[PDB]
């Protein structure tokens, strides 16, 4: 199962959204549940937009798309640690 790993990956992605004052672990769990229960990028984005009005739609879509891409990489055998490392790099915008 990939659910526990995906939750950690989504929480890392959420940590990179500036001034996103929310309980990251619960938002990550919510996103992962919506996906597991058959959600699409659009249905998940729409549910998030109603909850978090301050964040732009493109930022939310970016988080959800990352979740779907990460699920696929996990199914393709990529380790969660490697995925997290790439997200940290994107969040920091630095090779270092």
């Amino acid at each position: 199962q990939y659910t526990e790993n995906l939750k950690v990956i989504v929480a890392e992605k959420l940590a990179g959204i500036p001034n996103f004052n929310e309980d990251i672990k619960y938002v990550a769990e919510y996103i992962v549940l919506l996906i597991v229960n058959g959600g699409t990028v659009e249905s998940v984005v729409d549910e998030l937009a109603s909850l978090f009005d301050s964040v732009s739609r493109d930022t939310l879509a970016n988080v959800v798309q990352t979740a779907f891409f990460a699920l696929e990489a996990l199914q393709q055998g990529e380790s969660a640690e490697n995925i997290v490392s790439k997200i940290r790099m994107m969040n920091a915008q630095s090779l270092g």
């Binding site: 619960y26 919510y30 549940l33 229960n37």
Partner: peptide, 25 residues
């Protein structure tokens, strides 16, 4: 913000029940 967190918790619980209903089938 207390209200928003209660809402998110309620929504998570709803999704957990949906997942359970799917597994039972």
């Amino acid at each position: 913000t207390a209200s928003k967190m209660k809402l998110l918790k309620k929504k998570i619980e709803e999704q957990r029940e949906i997942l359970q209903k799917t597994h039972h089938k």
